């Protein structure tokens, strides 16, 4: 019954966003709640943010 098939391949770049599940190797899973501006993050004596 099939006369022809056209297969399209889409490449989607998925950036990380609130709701994406992130995890460590020690069973510490979690979901991103906020994406915080860099000047809002905690930072050490040298100004390097976390």
């Amino acid at each position: 019954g099939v006369l022809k098939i056209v297969k399209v391949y889409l490449a989607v770049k998925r950036r990380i966003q609130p709701g994406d599940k992130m995890a460590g190797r020690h069973g510490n899973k979690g979901v991103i709640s906020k994406i915080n501006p860099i000047e809002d993050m905690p930072y050490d004596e040298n100004g390097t943010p976390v």
Binding site: L3, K4, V6, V8, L10
Partner: protein, 50 residues
């Protein structure tokens, strides 16, 4: 009758057929988003019974 892969689609403007080639298939490299036609296809119908 046979369904037809075509760029000639009813009730669809020339803007939505902008990234389809003369065969009704999307170009490679085309940045598409949700709802964009990738392969244009029409199915023959009949007895619309207005």
């Amino acid at each position: 009758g046979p369904e037809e892969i075509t760029a000639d689609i009813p009730n669809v403007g020339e803007a939505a057929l902008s990234k389809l080639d003369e065969s009704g298939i999307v170009y490679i490299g085309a940045e598409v988003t949700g709802g964009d036609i990738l392969v244009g296809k029409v199915t023959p119908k009949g007895e619309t019974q207005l």
